[PDB]
Amino acid sequence: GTSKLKYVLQDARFFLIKSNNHENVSLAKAKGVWSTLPVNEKKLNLAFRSARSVILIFSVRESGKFQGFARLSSESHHGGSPIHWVLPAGMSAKMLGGVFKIDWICRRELPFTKSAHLTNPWNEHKPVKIGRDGQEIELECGTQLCLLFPPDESIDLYQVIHKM
Ligand SMILES: CNc1nc(Cl)nc2c1ncn2Cc1ccccc1NS(C)(=O)=O
């Protein structure tokens, strides 16, 4: 059902994550990690201490879709395994250094056409699909967005709930 998901989302914070390519989102789904640019890395570290759950909602640039959502399980960390991200032009590995661990809540896609009725107060009430990497999504809009995704019956939210 949707009851455990609603519990995880209670009083959560939500952030839009934008990726230039599918390869990096596939790697994030396989390994449970994400890296972002230093400005957003600072914002996410602050949010992680401030909320029971910090939810990252992923969208690959030019895909017209969200590719799923995940909960931060840690602040960013350095020096571990260099993740083999595909880097866009003008992007170095030292800029994507700093690895967050994430627990996927939904690995299913949602087309932007399905979220056209949701606007984000923190981005001038533009449709929630609009935003830069790291754009915060207000609680009510983020909750409704996450509830639009198809259920991912391959995920048991029991272990996620314990980490709260
Ligand atoms: C593994 N982490 C990432 N991997 C990829 Cl391939 N792209 C990312 C990632 N993190 C943020 N981006 C988007 C981006 C790339 C370059 C310059 C600015 C921006 N941010 S923007 C204009 O809002 O889209």
Curated annotation (Swiss-Prot):
The YTH domain mediates RNA-binding. Changing residue 19 to A: Does not affect ability to influence alternative splice site selection. RNA binds at residues 18-20, 34-35, 85, 133. This is YTH domain-containing protein 1. Residues 12-149 form the YTH domain. The modification Phosphoserine is found at residues 81, 92. Changing residue 34 to A: Abolishes binding to N6-methyladenosine (m6A)-containing RNAs. Abolishes binding to m6A-containing mRNAs. Changing residue 132 to D: Does not affect ability to influence alternative splice site selection. The gene is YTHDC1. Changing residue 34 to D: Abolishes RNA-binding and ability to influence alternative splice site selection. Changing residue 68 to I: Abolishes RNA-binding and ability to influence alternative splice site selection. It is found in: Nucleus; Nucleus speckle. The chain holds residues 345 to 507 of 727 of the full protein. Regulator of alternative splicing that specifically recognizes and binds N6-methyladenosine (m6A)-containing RNAs. M6A is a modification present at internal sites of mRNAs and some non-coding RNAs and plays a role in the efficiency of mRNA splicing, processing and stability. Acts as a key regulator of exon-inclusion or exon-skipping during alternative splicing via interaction with mRNA splicing factors SRSF3 and SRSF10. Changing residue 85 to A: Abolishes binding to N6-methyladenosine (m6A)-containing RNAs. Abolishes binding to m6A-containing mRNAs. Interacts with SRSF1. Interacts with SRSF2. Interacts with SRSF3. Interacts with SRSF7. Interacts with SRSF10. Interacts with CPSF6. Interacts with KHDRBS1/SAM68. Interacts with TRA2B. Interacts with KHDRBS3. Interacts with EMD. Interacts with RBMX. Interacts with ZCCHC8. Tyrosine phosphorylated.
